[PDB]
Amino acid sequence: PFFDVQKRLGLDLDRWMTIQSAEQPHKIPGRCHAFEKEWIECAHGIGGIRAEKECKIEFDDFVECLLRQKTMKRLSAIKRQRDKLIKEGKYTPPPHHLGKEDPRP
Amino acid sequence: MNIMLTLLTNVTLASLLVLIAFWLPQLNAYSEKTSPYECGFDPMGSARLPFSMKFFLVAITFLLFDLEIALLLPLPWASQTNNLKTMLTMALFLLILLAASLAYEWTQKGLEWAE
Amino acid sequence: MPLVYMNIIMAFAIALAGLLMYRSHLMSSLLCLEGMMLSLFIMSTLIILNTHFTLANMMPIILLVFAACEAALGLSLLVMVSNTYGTDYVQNLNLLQC
Amino acid sequence: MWFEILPGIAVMAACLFIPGMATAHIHKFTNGGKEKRVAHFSYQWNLMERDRRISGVNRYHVTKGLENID
Amino acid sequence: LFQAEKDRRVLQMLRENLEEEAIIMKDVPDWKVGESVFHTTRWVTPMMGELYGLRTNEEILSATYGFIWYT
Amino acid sequence: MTMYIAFILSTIFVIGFVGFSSKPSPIYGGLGLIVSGGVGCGIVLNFGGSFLGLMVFLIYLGGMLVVFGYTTAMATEMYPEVWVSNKTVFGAFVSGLMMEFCMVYYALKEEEVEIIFKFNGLGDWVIYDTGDSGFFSEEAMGIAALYSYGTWLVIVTGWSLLIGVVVIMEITRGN
Amino acid sequence: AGRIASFLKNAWAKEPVLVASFAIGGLAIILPSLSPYTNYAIRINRATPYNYPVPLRDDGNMPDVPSHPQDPQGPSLEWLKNL
Amino acid sequence: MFMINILSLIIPILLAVAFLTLVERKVLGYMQLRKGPNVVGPYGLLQPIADALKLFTKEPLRPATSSISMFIIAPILALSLALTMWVPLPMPYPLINMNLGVLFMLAMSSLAVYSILWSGWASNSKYALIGALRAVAQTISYEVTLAIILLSVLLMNGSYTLSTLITTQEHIWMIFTSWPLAMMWFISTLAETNRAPFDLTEGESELVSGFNVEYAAGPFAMFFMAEYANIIMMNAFTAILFLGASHDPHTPELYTINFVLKTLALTITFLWIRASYPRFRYDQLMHLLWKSFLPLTLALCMWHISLPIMTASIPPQS
Amino acid sequence: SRGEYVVAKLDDLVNWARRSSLWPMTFGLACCAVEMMHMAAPRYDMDRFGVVFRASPRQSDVMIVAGTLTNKMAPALRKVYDQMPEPRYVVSMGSCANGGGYYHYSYSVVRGCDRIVPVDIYVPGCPPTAEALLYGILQLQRKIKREKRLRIWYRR
Ligand SMILES: CCCCCCCCCCCCCCCCC[C@@H](O)O[C@H](CO[C@H](O)CCCCCCCCCCCCCCC)COP(=O)(O)OCC[N+](C)(C)C
Ligand SMILES: CCCCCCCCCCCCCCCCC[C@@H](O)O[C@H](CO[C@H](O)CCCCCCCCCCCCCCC)COP(=O)(O)OCC[N+](C)(C)C
Ligand SMILES: CCCCCCCCCCCCCCCCC[C@@H](O)O[C@H](CO[C@H](O)CCCCCCCCCCCCCCC)COP(=O)(O)OCC[N+](C)(C)C
Ligand SMILES: CCCCCCCC/C=C\CCCCCCCC(=O)O[C@H](COC(=O)CCCCCCC/C=C/CCCCCCCC)COP(=O)(O)OCCN
Ligand SMILES: CCCCCCCCCCC1=C(C)C(=O)C(OC)=C(OC)C1=O
Ligand code: SF4
User: Which PANTHER family match (chain G) (predicted)?
Assistant: First the structure.
């Protein structure tokens, strides 16, 4: 089914391309390099069954970095509250959030 | 942003030229005038009938040889790598098989059109 | 997810349904196969660009190469079928039953 | 021719002169007169954006020298 | 110098967003101001939406498609 | 929010997919696939994939030219069908259009799990990275890595191409 | 000796295009392995600083690492100036 | 202000095409011991205006058997793509500065063939169908060789940016390094623009008018303008690729003048070639491209990959 | 009036454009077509007047009936005449095309091409010289110069 010729011969036929934290050209990092690094080092050598349970926090962080669902939910909630507050006139946006900011280098 | 404006301007100019050509002159269309042309006479059959392609085999090979271009176009960027020996070996290896594929179809009469 | 991801996924689904539902011409189904490949290319490229995974920037090119191989195979089979029957209709391919 | 072909060639050359000269003049007119900046990579775009931010008039080509460091 | 200025600009934008979020989300009963969505306590590179969420559309265009559209 | 350009491009992508999936005459199918390839090239360009989008556009242009030649050779009829010349083709086209409309509406006006998961929209600009460095294109570097990192991929791809040439010649032999 | 000579004469008489193509391809295949400047090309590729050189934390046991760019330690590109 | 630049690009190109028609007529006349147009205006300078006004005041006709949408779309696509091909050309500055200008031009050129194909098919006439199939054959003949020639030539440039070609040729023309590739590229551009001896799609002696036989009036004129604009654009691209003009950043008009004379010389070379030779058979064109051009192109691609490594002359800007 | 002046000037422009760009169909029948070729020859060089042969009837402005029109050929000539977009002109060249000529009493010859299509200019001769055909073409140009379509429309 899976004859690990690569591991027996130490060839690295396709293992250079399996993960995002593995030796990219010019040392260009992946957008979620640290989260995947943490999750891989948490789950290494303990087996797939345990990796799912004792490393669920790192995987949740990695998935949040990948898809950013919770961040978008928080931003949507904040903007909905902001729109609700302006429509009744209780809140006014600051000048630096309306295009009249003082830029810095 | 600029490229979309340029494309829109070009397409708009062409469409406006078509509109001017189609609405400015006087039109007198009748059946004899709008009929299909075959130099003096009515066509025997339809122009939608199957039209045999004698170069059908070269057309299939063009599909495979066109993707050779996709694999070879990043070559200018590949020449900037440190392991130049590996890149040169693989670049020369890829073209050699492309040359051998052409040689195989040539020697097996694949480039000659159907009779 | 972005809504563009849903758009590309529905493009794949529509092309798959178009392949699975057959009209008279064999050629139409090959175009649906090519459309599925195009949607796969677009989706994979978007995923790779978004996550900045540098090394899989070459993977869609391999996808395109094997897409060309598939298209050549399908066109060759269509050539033989049309040479046999003079038409690329699927209903002529009924010599073999279950 | 034979020199009567020349007027048409000259008209065509005059027509072909216009695009590049107009492009250069428009670039100079809309970039402070100094050859519109080229940003083929993200670092050049970052330089352009910083130049726009520190100009004070939201224009990258407005250049601040040593007179802006009091 | 560019790295130092980038750090300061990003931190200032995050602080301004935090203050505006504190003002806006006061009426929500169970909302923690500046609450992270990650279990880890290490620094996370801010997402584009987080920096420019409460700003004008022109700035968002310039930040997202400014370089790609520049020709 | 910002100009939703990629949303329009992806909607046109889906529209072209419906166009060639309702399966009119292969001429119009190829036209729809060309439109889809162009708008997909534009989509990929809008996220920074200039090379990949342009390359897929070029490849599909060549493929569709070959497909047009083959359609004229072996897929013609006396009256080629368009999207309005047949009840079945028109029904499929309208059904695809309204299915896409329903999905889009249910997607942006509320949050539902269509098939896989849900989403709210917010435009594509939110998920970007605002990374600021480099005298190169990361897409170009990753693609050029094929000749230094992907030796195995180059080997299998070249073998597959040569075998494909041999295969088409074997199939089209006849006898 | 003479068989290959006659074969090459016939090929030059009938298919000069293929003869030239094979000669150019063979030269392109074999010449790079005998060139002394291939290593120079590799070194030139290595000498291009695409990314920032991250400094090392000094621990008092690196005699071959400079403390300033103009210090004599580290790689030198003098060979490149005269190339 | 950018729309001003778009117009200052497109309108003079149309004027140049209009007067290129007259230049062709006069040059082919004088190579044939006659004069060509010299009555409509002094030295025939008013002939293109009369031709355009006659063509756009003449009745256009829809064939009864034609497919109307594609029939109308094809000339629009042709003219719009012909105009679009000019935007990345650096003269010395481009209207649109692209990282990949050469490959963009490749893709747009590949798309341009569909105007011919769709016009021929939608005309629903036998001669137009023959012309469209000949166009399919021509593209199959030239595309791969042209692309690999571009690859081999640009290997010495270091990127696909068109403006870098000026820097690459600061001291010498690229032709002095790749003249076999230059000859093959010249023949490939002759085939790509459907010009004699490869003017197979129109095929006037054999197919009467070929793909555009059904077309009349204004729509016909747009096909003509698209073809001539493509000729000028291809010659300008060849001039940029193989004949590098020295550019002074403080005086770009010198580069503009040098560029214009070189592209005019290349266009006149096309005109001369048309005046000199008979027409190929359209199977002979494919045999020429696949049995002679393709092997040399592959060998020279190998050679131009190996040469910068052997001589330590790899260009910058990965 | 102002409108009368405007339509007169527009007529002048359109007539100049049409008579300065006259494209005859590539169409000949007999002996006369040889003199047509000689009128296209370098000595006379009709292209210098703006006269270019075009094969497609869709792209042609004038038909020159140069040769005998037989009964078997008349439907084809009528077909190619009809397919010509307007404005279109017909020039009859030679005795055969004018009135039947030397085969006038034949059983298989149409006694003049004006039985099939309207004719604008009749060029006499058997064959007319290339110079005579050039004179006929210039006369057709002068006749086109006298058209007043827009004046007639304005006075309607
Ligand atoms: C070079 C690039 C730039 C070009 C710029 C110009 C672009 C021009 C585009 C093409 C339009 C001009 C064509 C010629 C003029 C238009 C004439 C015609 O198209 O319109 C007529 C429109 O007529 C309509 O069918 C009915 C007329 C009434 C319509 C009522 C619309 C609302 C009017 C309300 C009246 C009160 C005033 C409202 C306006 C302020 C229909 O003409 P028709 O006879 O078929 O065609 C024959 C053409 N001939 C006669 C010139 C040879
Ligand atoms: C056990 C039996 C062996 C023979 C039969 C095996 C059948 C399979 C075909 C060949 C086996 C594949 C083995 C080669 C795997 C490639 C990887 C390895 O060789 O290392 C490469 C060494 O490169 C070599 O040149 C590999 C190329 C040699 C193969 C090309 C020709 C042989 C293929 C023959 C079969 C293919 C089909 C038929 C074609 C004739 C790259 O190393 P390097 O670049 O240092 O460092 C990479 C790490 N970086 C990126 C961080 C720098
Ligand atoms: C700007 C874009 C939109 C407009 C598009 C059109 C572009 C402008 C048109 C260019 C006008 C030039 C034509 C003038 C050439 C006339 C040459 C002269 O010879 O004409 C003479 C007299 O002139 C003519 O009678 C009238 C010509 C001028 C027409 C009036 C001017 C109208 C201009 C209005 C412009 C409006 C355009 C449309 C705007 C929407 C008659 O002599 P002719 O018999 O030949 O020669 C005899 C041959 N020989 C010498 C060898 C013996
Ligand atoms: C080691 C180099 C390899 C890589 C470099 C090559 C890259 C590209 C070149 C290869 C492309 C494929 C070419 C395939 C050759 C097909 C041969 C063939 O069958 O053609 C014969 C004709 O060709 C032959 O004569 C058969 C082979 C003859 C020998 C060809 C060259 C062999 C090697 C010669 C040079 C060797 C190296 C150069 C050294 C020069 C001496 C100093 C049939 O001709 P038709 O076109 O069908 O005839 C129609 C009209 N009668
Ligand atoms: C381009 C050179 C000028 C060609 C002029 C067009 C000739 C049209 C007459 C047709 C014709 C041709 C072509 C012709 O070749 C010929 O001789 C057999 C005739 O017999 C008189 C003809 O009638
Ligand atoms: S008129 Fe005289 S020259 Fe002309 S075709 Fe008749 S017989 Fe021949």
Answer: NADH DEHYDROGENASE [UBIQUINONE] 1 ALPHA SUBCOMPLEX SUBUNIT 3
Greatest CA separation found in chain G? Answer: 74
Chain H's closest residue to F58, CA to CA, is H107
Using CA positions, which residue lies closest to atom 38 of ligand 4?
Answer: G23
Question: d(Cα I25, Cα H127) in Å, to the nearest integer?
Answer: 17
Which residue's CA lies nearest to atom 34 of ligand 4? G19
Q: Determine contact, residues C52/F54, Cβ cutoff 8 Å.
A: no
B87 lies in a domain? yes
- CA distances I10 to E70, I17, I105, I149, I154, Å, are 46, 11, 47, 10, 12
Distance set, CA H27 to CA D2, D5, H272, H279, H297 (Å): 8, 7, 8, 19, 33
Residue I32 is labelled as binding a ligand:
yes
I contacts of H217 (beta carbons < 8 Å): 85
Query: In this complex, do C35 and F168 lie within 8 Å of one another by their Cβ atoms?
Result: no
Q: Which two tokens stand for residue H41?
A: 């205006």
Residue C53, in any domain of the structure = yes
Q: For chain F, what is the domain count?
A: 1
CB within 8 Å: D41 and F132: no
Closest Cα to atom 46 of ligand 4: H291
Query: CA–CA separation, H293 vs I111, rounded Å?
Result: 58
Method: cryo-EM
Whole-number Å distance between alpha carbons of I67 and F72: 40
Taking only Cα atoms into account, the Rg of chain B, rounded to an integer number of angstroms, comes to: 26
What the block records as the tokens of C45 is 């490229």
Tell me which chain F residues have a C-beta less than 8 angstroms from the C-beta of G51: 133
- For residue F52, which amino acid is it? L
Taking phi over 0 as left and psi of -120 to 50 as alpha, with beta for the rest, G51 belongs to beta
Resolution in A: 2.5
Does residue I113 have a known ligand-binding role?
no
CB contact at 8 A, B39 and I77: no
- Torsion sign (Cα): A24, A25, A27, A31: negative
CATH number at residue F106: 1.20.120.1200
Q: What is the CATH number of domain I2-155?
A: 3.40.50.12280
- Verify whether ligand 2 is closer than 6 Å to residue B89 (CB atom): yes
Q: Could you give the number of structural domains in chain C? A: 1
Ligand nearest to the Cα of I86, by number: 1
* CA distances from residue A9 to A5, A18, B26, F20, G8 in whole angstroms, order as listed: 6, 18, 82, 48, 45
Using alpha carbons only, how large is chain A's radius of gyration in Å?
23
Interchain contact C64–B (C-beta under 8 A): yes
Sheet holding I121-123, edge to edge: I62-66, I89-93, I121-123
| 3-state class (DSSP) for residue H37 | coil
Flag whether B114 is in a domain: no
* Residue that is written with structure tokens 């290339």 in the block: I130
Euclidean distance between CA atoms A22 and B61, whole angstroms: 38
CA E61 to chain B, closest CA, distance in angstroms equals: 11
Element (H, E) at H183: helix H175-192
Q: What contacts H307, CB < 8 A, 6 or more positions away?
A: G28, H313
Tokens for I51, please give them: 């006269």
| B32 Cα to the center of ligand 6, angstroms | 29
Amino acid (one-letter) located at I15: N
Q: For chain B, what is the domain count?
A: 1
* Domain contains C92: no
Cβ of residue I73 lying under 6 Å from some atom of ligand 5: no
The shortest CB-CB distance from A16 to any of F136, F138, F149 is to F149
Angle at G66 between CA G60 and CA G69, to 5 degrees: 150
Tokens of E11: 């931190």
Ligand 6 site, residue I30, Cβ cutoff 6 A: yes
| Distance (Å, whole) CA A77 – CA H105 | 46
Q: What is the CATH number of the domain that holds B32?
A: 1.20.58.1610
Cβ pair E9, E46 in contact under 8 A: no
Domain that holds residue B19: 1-108
For residue F26, give its domain range.
Answer: 5-172
